[PDB]
């Protein structure tokens, strides 16, 4: 098992995560690169695998406590930048890969807390750590 | 931690906050201009970053009560103006962007209130005051 | 604060409210004409305003109980027109627009009442009474 | 008030209403014109009215019970037809419409009823008898 | 009323029905020809009926118990068929027509069951037996 | 009856499941090639059956402990492959199929877990080993 | 505004209208008789305008009502001849010109309607009854 | 309302309608021989009419379904003639003209039917059987 | 910048703009004298210039309105003229130029607008009053 | 009904499909020999039929899987020859004729396949196996 | 990667962008010489190369935004002449080439901006700056 | 099944691929020189085959990222020569074809890329690598 406190999204500015993250999710996809030729053993569906593009999305939401990194990613935004994002797998490692800052998002309630979603799109080429 | 009561949007007539603010959300966007070259050190999508367009859309909800920044709502929809709005976020800052008065609409209920949506979007060039 | 009972859509036959109006719901819109040139002094996205077409819809359930004003929105839609139609906001004021009776339905059940919905969109230029 | 039991659907065959009547709803529609010239005294969406098409659709649900106009039904959907439908609101008065048998579904479950939903929509001019 | 547990989908190998069969649902379709001529008594969308193309969906869920029959649809699946297929109605009988096995999927989780959806269509032409 | 526990995907590196398993769900499908002649002997539509196409799909969900063959799937995902998978049926027996690692996720909470949703989808012919 | 619905064309047999009349289309039009002299006050190219000739041309398009003015159509077109045709303007009045019936067919699919396009161009001098 | 299920296009061998028959034109012409003399009215385009050579021509979409009056087609093309041809229009009647066989063609995709495109062009007078 | 509500075409009876404007377009044009010698630099293609005609077109769309400019427009067609018609452009100012009719074109469907384009174009030397 | 996989163009080498077999026409024309004498029963165009030369043309589209016949091809193109090329029809037969190999192109995207056009057409007699 | 918001098209006066310049498309082009000398190792086309002419176009869109530059472009097309232009690449660097003015065009709508195109091509010898 | 990453345009200076190459097509073409003596066994169309001339044309897409790759390629266009291009064809091999650089266009957007379409068309004799 595996603490959900353990996957950490992180800033650059050196790399230090921000401060509200209620959850996060990174998600990656490809798209299916669909190679139907009329012969196939069962008339199954093939498939070709490695011509499909990839990529990655990541979605953090959380409670605005002002930060360093929180005021990063606002200057991420307005001066529209590429740089190197940084997530950690408790037991895997660290991606590290260069992503935007495609949508963020603040949000406040007459009785509740000044909250916000943070969401990412792949950029670039990703690594693994292991 | 920051209270949701200390994120608000304002309108000008000189800035003040509408009536009922029950729950507001700005939000940002970028589309993701895409730059898939077929070089690509493990097949991954890479992206541009800064070509994208960049956004915001406000969402504010709230409970009708008769002000003069609710009339002025009104009056920015009926005689249609792009105004400057500004949303402070906490410990951030106000955001002081010209956004559009999008969609708005009041409801009621047999039993319930008279209530509002108000949803904003950007139209030109934002801020931040830190 | 402002009572849900006192905002009220009415017809002309001299305005008189419907029957069931349970819960009613004046929805606005504007198009956001998107004016993005190349420049923008961080890539933001720029707005025109005045330039989107604006719109209003009336959503209005309740349950079915006959009268002159239920039978004449029947007769407004065989008969299909565009007549007045007017919404009063509690403390704004009414707004006694144009507009026509795009789709009703009515519904029963074995156990319950015999209910519509009443959904009407803008068909011309509104006003507001202050 | 008018009690949910009296809005009937009834088919021909002379008119009967159908066995399981669970939940009933006609739904009528128009699909709104938009005539909106350059001018408009704010900019506002100016429609036609009485230029668009206009429906009506049937909605009901229920338990199968058979009866013959429970078998009629099938044999309107097998060969497929568009008699006349007709649904009484309470105090308003019938319909009397040609409909069509649009989708039926029968549905059963491991401890459940034998259910369905059956799906009508408008097939020529309807009526009103007041 | 009639007991949901009387309706049946039932496969060829003479026929039988399959083990978990928790849920079914028959659902009919036609896609309603509009032949809305510019005469219409009140502008009235008119319809054709009998030149509208008819369906038929089988939707049957269960619980993944293995037999024959069970082994049978997928022997369908992947040798791809257009058997004919069977459902009772309780009281008004078969329907026994030709369908195709277009999605099934078998599920399980950590602590519940082997699960299954079976999604059919209609593939030919269909009957019944009174 | 079949427990939820015995139906298992699982990777090749020889074939092992991997570790966090919450929920999984094999999918097929098929497009349903419509041949619908103009004589149909009630006007039913006609189906081809064996000329569609068919699909399968994997979505798995659990929470991420440490295995290799939770590695395996990431060094799937980046030298993007498509390899051997294979998923038990109860009863029935493995599927053996080449799929592909279309899109995977990794998601955290501030309390809850690391937990990782893994969706794929075919790429060849499939079996079935009764 | 004016309704789409009014605008008419119209055969002889004392004029009616055809059936099917889902969308009409009269086109004017003139060839521009380009009168360019050397001399011109900016090199701007100069025309003549009266000299040029003009046309009219109805293209209207329906579904295949049987109706005698349909029947007169096939009977113009058959018997060729260039009768008076009437083409109302909702709030202008009508053109009463002389048009041939240049180009007709009749079209009908699988599963639609039989349908019809009707194209015509003007044969003499044309009118205006304002 | 006419069914578009009921025009056909049928061949000699005695009077047959094609297999695939998915959707079909038949389409008149007529090449609009223009007489405009120096006078005219107000310097309209004179027209004569019935000095115009007229024309058909059939288009007809469809699904390959092997047929005896399928073959007929092929074996039309490659002994090269011009039998009759005879097009019902739902309530009009036939047409029942000597066309000739102009351009086929079979298409096929990986995953698709066998379709085939039959375009036909007059060939001699036409008829008409009320 | 400008709002498209701004640009505005003209007729003379003083001037007026007619009333469907939904989308107009002013379009310049030079044919591009091709003055290439042997002789040129890189043999590039060398132009001249102020040798080439140069023109002007408008096509003016919209809603059939009747007025008094919009039965101008029909007695300019009929009475050829080439009177002097202006266009704004916001900021830039009028042109002011004599233009002709050269092709107008009035549509109307079975459920849409009596809609209408208005082609014109450049009939003299032109201005621009800044 | 007919699969579209069983439709198949194949080249010599004895005759092997080729590889990406993605969408594949096979299309025949006739250039239809207008033979209009002065008299003719209705001014009617006639037609001769057997004097027009008639065509056949294969489009093959597929993804670039290496084969020996997709190597053969290329060498069909390099030196340039008209070898025997079959298709079959599904229930149809073959055509086996001879076919030159026009014109060809291999394309690829930054991200998609290696896919290629394959377009032939007609050199000699073709036949047909029934 | 470049920015598209970097390459500028840019007018002389000295040079300013011109206002609206959304998108914007230098568009170089040589009309290849062909040489095919009855020699040739494969039959193969042989091409000259520099013996044929090379252009350069320059297609510009945008809203209109009064400016200086904007006013240019009228007095350039007015008063014809073939002054310097100069465009951007990114990281090439600019062109710097005698252009003319050939087609400019404003547009506006009801509802939409002021926009306009404006195409431009070579008139003389290009060059680049590095 | 081969990638569409894999094909890959290359220029000289020794190759290297451009920069941006989105998407390329290589296209072949022969001319069809047709032969159509008066006999032939069925009005058939006779060609010849290799008396046609045979062609290649290279169309690449991309976005503009500065490499000397793609700094050759302007000067291939101003300096204008034939030199040796390359395509390699996956598992096929290379091309190595001397080919012009017809026409090359730089574009870019205001929000959108430097992107680039490069053109080129076939100066000679061709080859293959195996």
Same mark, same amino acid.
Do not use: C
């Given at each position: 098992?595996?603490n959900?406190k353990?996957? #950490?999204?992180?800033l650059?500015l050196?790399? &230090?995560?921000?401060?509200g993250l209620? $959850?996060?999710?990174?998600?990656?996809?490809?798209?299916?690169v669909d190679?139907? =030729? #009329?012969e196939?053993?069962?008339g199954?569906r093939?498939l070709l695998?490695?011509?499909g593009?990839?990529?990655?999305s990541? =979605?953090? $939401?959380?409670?605005?406590?002002d930060?360093d990194?929180d &005021?990063r990613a606002?200057?991420?935004?307005?001066?529209g930048?590429?740089?190197?994002?940084?997530?950690i797998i408790?037991?895997f490692?660290?991606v590290?890969?260069p992503?935007?800052?495609? =949508?963020?998002?603040?949000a406040? =309630?007459?009785?509740? &807390?000044?909250?916000y &979603? #943070?969401?990412?799109?792949s950029?670039?080429?990703?690594?693994?750590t292991?």
């Amino acid at each position: 098992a595996q603490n959900g406190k353990d996957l #950490l999204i992180k800033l650059d500015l050196q790399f &230090e995560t921000i401060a509200g993250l209620r $959850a996060t999710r990174i998600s990656f996809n490809a798209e299916t690169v669909d190679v139907t =030729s #009329l012969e196939s053993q069962g008339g199954w569906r093939e498939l070709l695998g490695g011509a499909g593009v990839r990529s990655a999305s990541i =979605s953090g $939401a959380g409670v605005f406590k002002d930060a360093d990194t929180d &005021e990063r990613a606002r200057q991420i935004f307005f001066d529209g930048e590429v740089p190197e994002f940084q997530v950690i797998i408790p037991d895997f490692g660290i991606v590290q890969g260069p992503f935007m800052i495609t =949508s963020i998002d603040y949000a406040g =309630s007459h009785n509740g &807390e000044a909250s916000y &979603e #943070l969401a990412m799109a792949s950029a670039g080429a990703l690594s693994f750590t292991a």
